């Protein structure tokens, strides 16, 4: 499985194009704020939303703590999707600069 740190993810903002981020937390959690540009698809619904993922692209998956997102990454890869886990989750990403 592939993974990157939150520090690495933030520095990605300084790159040419924005990366694809998928926030798999639940509704009330995302209600507290999300990373600008992130798509919200709860983990439980990932199996029914495979059509969202473009096979030619890569998706960075984030959750509250980093474990559940890793589970989603493995699931996605085993279904032909390119995914990377964001280590530490939103806990480590922090509550600064989020979209409310
Ligand atoms: Na959504």
Pick the catalytic residue from 22, 24, 63, 81. 63
Q: What is the resolution of this structure in A?
A: 1.6
Expressed in angstroms and rounded, the spacing between residue 4 Cα and the centre of ligand 1 is 23
Domain count, the chain: 1
Expressed in angstroms and rounded, the spacing between residue 2 Cα and the centre of ligand 1 is 24
Expressed in angstroms and rounded, the spacing between residue 42 Cα and the centre of ligand 1 is 8
Experimental method: X-ray
- CATH number of the domain where residue 14 is located: 3.40.250.10
Expressed in angstroms and rounded, the spacing between residue 61 Cα and the centre of ligand 1 is 14
Residues with CB under 5 A from ligand 1 (ion): 40
Pairing of strands 82-86, 39-40: unpaired
Cβ proximity of 40 and 62 under 8 Å:
no
SS3 74: helix
Known catalytic residue: 46?
no
Neighbouring residues of 18: CB distance < 8 A, sequence distance ≥ 6: 37
- For residue 48, give both structure tokens: 């029914």
Give the C-alpha separation, 45 to 88, whole Å: 22
Residue 26: give the domain boundaries. Answer: 2-100
Give the C-alpha separation, 65 to 86, whole Å: 9
Please name the residue that has the structure tokens 């032909």: 80
Give the C-alpha separation, 51 to 46, whole Å: 10
């Amino acid at each position: 499985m592939e993974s990157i740190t939150v520090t690495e993810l933030k520095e990605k903002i300084l790159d040419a194009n924005p990366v694809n981020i998928v926030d798999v937390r639940t509704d009330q959690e995302t209600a507290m704020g999300i990373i600008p540009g992130a798509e919200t698809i709860p983990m439980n619904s990932i199996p029914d939303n495979l059509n969202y993922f473009n096979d030619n692209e890569t998706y960075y998956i984030i959750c509250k703590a980093g474990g559940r997102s890793a589970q989603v990454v493995q699931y996605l890869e085993q279904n032909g999707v390119n995914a990377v886990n964001v280590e530490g989750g939103m806990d480590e990403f922090g509550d600064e600069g989020l979209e409310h």
